[PDB]
Amino acid sequence: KQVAGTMKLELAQYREVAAFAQFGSDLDAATQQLLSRGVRLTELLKQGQYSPMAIEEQVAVIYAGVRGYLDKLEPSKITKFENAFLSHVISQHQALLGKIRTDGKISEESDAKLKEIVTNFLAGFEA
Amino acid sequence: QLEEVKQASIKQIQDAIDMEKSQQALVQKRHYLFDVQRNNIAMALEVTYRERLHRVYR
Amino acid sequence: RKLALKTIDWVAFGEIIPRNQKAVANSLKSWNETLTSRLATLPEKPPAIDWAYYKANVAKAGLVDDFEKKFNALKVPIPEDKYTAQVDAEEKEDVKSCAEFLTQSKTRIQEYEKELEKMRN
Amino acid sequence: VGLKAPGIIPRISVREPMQTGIKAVDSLVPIGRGQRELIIGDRQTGKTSIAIDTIINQKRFNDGTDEKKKLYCIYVAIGQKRSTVAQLVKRLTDADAMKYTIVVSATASDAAPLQYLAPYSGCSMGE
Amino acid sequence: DPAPATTFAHLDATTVLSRAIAELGIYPAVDPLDSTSRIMDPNIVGSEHYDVARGVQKILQDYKSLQDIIAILGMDELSEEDKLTVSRARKIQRFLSQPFQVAEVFTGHLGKLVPLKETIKGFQQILAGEYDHLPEQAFYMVGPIEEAVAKADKLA
Amino acid sequence: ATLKDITRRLKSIKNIQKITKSMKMVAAAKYARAERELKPARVYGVGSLALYEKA
């Protein structure tokens, strides 16, 4: 709920305007972001076949995008990120993942970590 | 008069601060680098021993 | 053997890039991860074997008994260093960092501080 | 097999999730237990694939020792060629989710009432 | 139609030939999107192909999508990139056309074999836009991709 | 036509509808801006005509 609520909603909005244009272009930035993001989110709801996931990861990665992070990122490399990141938090922040799992939820603190993790991780993922 | 004193003020402390910060970093980071390499090595081998056991038992 | 256990500070590493080892770092992240995440998943041992009960139900007999005794009596090889001089190649380049570079550098650094005092004053 | 549907009082609503690992699904239609949900889509949507990865997902849940987070899986195959099934099974085998799993398999060959019946049967088992 | 509807279950790979495509004169005249395999899904063909195809599928579909634009705007009008992709789709389409040994009588050109690697690769190149400089109908009714290239020369 | 066909139709008619709409607002978006932008400009070009305007 914490990550998704907004997203469900976002996708909704995204979707009508997702449907709009794409006429080799689109128009205002606001929406352009939503699209960019959206597109990302689309990847986020994606998943290859033979690839079921754990909720904490899922929430996690979603959290990233939601938190407006990878909307910068460009689509093939999202996928790439996603992996990298995922194995990363698993690796590193299994601790944290542990926490989130534990709390059964993100905690603002878990978030704070996550975000932090992410931001750097993201940074590493990129640069 | 007063301009040059504060101007020199920044520049002289700058070259220090930066160099003492550079010095402190390299010690721990260079020991970390060494460390991490040892890390990566050890892993692989226990893996190599581990893998053989699974393989032959199969 | 084991595992090296050690510490990774990512903004530190990556930035370091003394040219003669720089390249390794950029690659070195990606190489390490391969091992890291992989090993975390696998198990190290497989199942075990009750040779007697299986043997009793085999009809090409005494073969299982042969393999059984030989297996239990047997030890597999191990895998071994090409390089534990690298271990030391560090302390030498660490001499490079400190004494050689440290001292002459340190002196310059200190002086500027004291210098700055007076040129604030 | 003749078993009553639970009474109102016997019923109790959901408060439970349940996951499938499908990012999208668990996100946007966050998975619950005790329910019913139409999975709908065309031929080889990986239709089955979609389901499979979910089943696979339950592995962790059967490793997820909360008992109401351990799931005994029931797969009703209606009119499903043995070959297909063989594959399916084959996946399941690989996944050996099968250990906590009944696979009721009614390939097209089965006489029609049998095929008809099978779900109810499956149903009985799940009740 | 119920029958085919049923039918599908029993199948392993379904090749649905697109009469529309046929109608495009195309030969092989397939419905590519429905030239399919349950022995296809990402690893049931594996992804190169799959993806290449997904890209491909995407581009044609998208080309369909773009048709909609064109429906307003024209035979040479859109965003250029889109034009590339369109073209790529039109080319790809053509590259999919292949002579027939059987119907060499009809076609006037004997069928081809592009053994798979050269096949995947073939498209992969086009996808790589390698050929782009090249023209589409030079790919029409070809086997091996080079021969299409060759054919371009043969045009001019 | 036969109902399918009708739908076949419809599908696209909507698509069209959208598409038309797409342009509509899109154009309008461009427009929306554009009209505003006309101010200094308008004036400006109107300006351009100075001279004959007079002499």
Quote the minimal CA–CA distance from E79 to chain A in Å: 5
**Helix, strand, or coil (residue E36):** strand
User: What is the H or E stretch that residue E111 is in?
Assistant: none
The CA-atom distances, in angstroms, between E82 and each of E67, E150, F29 are: 11, 26, 22
Q: Read off φ and ψ for residue A124, nearest 5 degrees.
A: -65, -35
DSSP element (H, E) containing A56: helix A55-66
**DSSP annotation of F53:** T
Half-sphere exposure of B11 (CA within 13 A, CB side): 7
Sign of CA dihedral A50, A55, A56, A60: positive
State how far residue A110 is from chain C, nearest Cα, in angstroms.
21
**Tokens in use for A94?**
């299994």
Contact flag for F and E (3+ C-beta pairs < 8 Å): yes
- Token pair belonging to D21: 């690992």
Q: How far is C11 from chain A (nearest CA, A)?
A: 9
Residue with tokens 């402390």, as numbered in its chain: B13
CB-nearest partner of E38 from D44, D79, D108: D44
Tokens for D127? Answer: 């009740």
Chains contacting chain C through 3 or more C-beta pairs under 8 A: A, B
> By the 8 A CB rule, do D105 and D80 touch?
yes
Residues of D in contact with E12 (CB under 8 A): 83
Q: Name residue E78's amino acid.
A: L
**∠ CA C68-C74-C78 to the nearest 5 degrees?**
140
Q: Answer whether A15 touches F (CB < 8 Å).
A: no
Q: Going by C-beta distance under 8 Å and a sequence separation of 6 or more, which residues neighbour residue F30?
A: A27
Q: Please report the residues numbered 1 through 55 in chain F whose beta carbons come closer than 8 angstroms to any beta carbon of chain E.
A: 12, 15-16, 19-20, 23
**Distance in angstroms (rounded) separating the CA atoms of residues C23 and B32:** 17
Asked if E51 and E89 touch (Cβ cutoff 8 Å), the reply is no
**Hey, of A23, A39, A79, which one would you mutate to test binding to chain E, going by the most E CBs within 10 A of its CB?**
A23
What torsion, rounded to 10 degrees, do the Cα atoms E41, E47, E48, E49 define? -10
Number of domains in chain A: 1
Taking the CA atoms of B22, B27, B29 and B30 in sequence, report the sign of the dihedral they define.
positive
Is there a contact between E69 and A25 if contact means CB atoms under 8 Å apart? no
For the record, the structure tokens of C21 come out as: 């080892």
Other beta carbons within 10 angstroms of residue E123's beta carbon come to: 23
Domain range for residue A33? 1-127
Q: Which amino acid is present at A70?
A: L
Its sign, for the CA torsion F24, F29, F34, F36, is positive
Which residues of A define the annotated binding site for ATP?
47, 49
Q: Which residues make Cβ contacts (< 8 Å) with residue A123, sequence separation at least 6?
A: none
Task: Please tell me whether residue D78 adopts helix, strand or coil conformation.
Answer: strand
- Which one of A80, A81, A86, A87 would you mutate to disrupt binding with C, by most C Cβ within 10 Å of its Cβ? A87
Residues 6+ apart with CB under 8 A from A93: A113, A114, A117
Asked whether the beta carbons of residue D27 and residue A51 sit closer than 8 angstroms, the reply is: no
Task: Check CB contact under 8 Å for B23 and C109.
Answer: yes
Give the Cα separation of C100 and D21 in Å (integer).
Answer: 56
| Closest approach of A120 to chain C, Cα-based (Å) | 9
CATH number at residue A100: 1.20.150.20
User: Residue D73 pairs with which residues in a beta bridge?
Assistant: D101
Experimental method: cryo-EM
Resolution of the coordinates, Å: 6.4
Packing angle, helices A75-91 and A29-45, rounded to 10: 60
Query: What is the SS3 assignment for A24?
Result: coil
Q: What is the DSSP letter of A93?
A: T
Identify all chain F residues contacting A20, using CB atoms and an 8 Å cutoff.
Answer: 18, 22
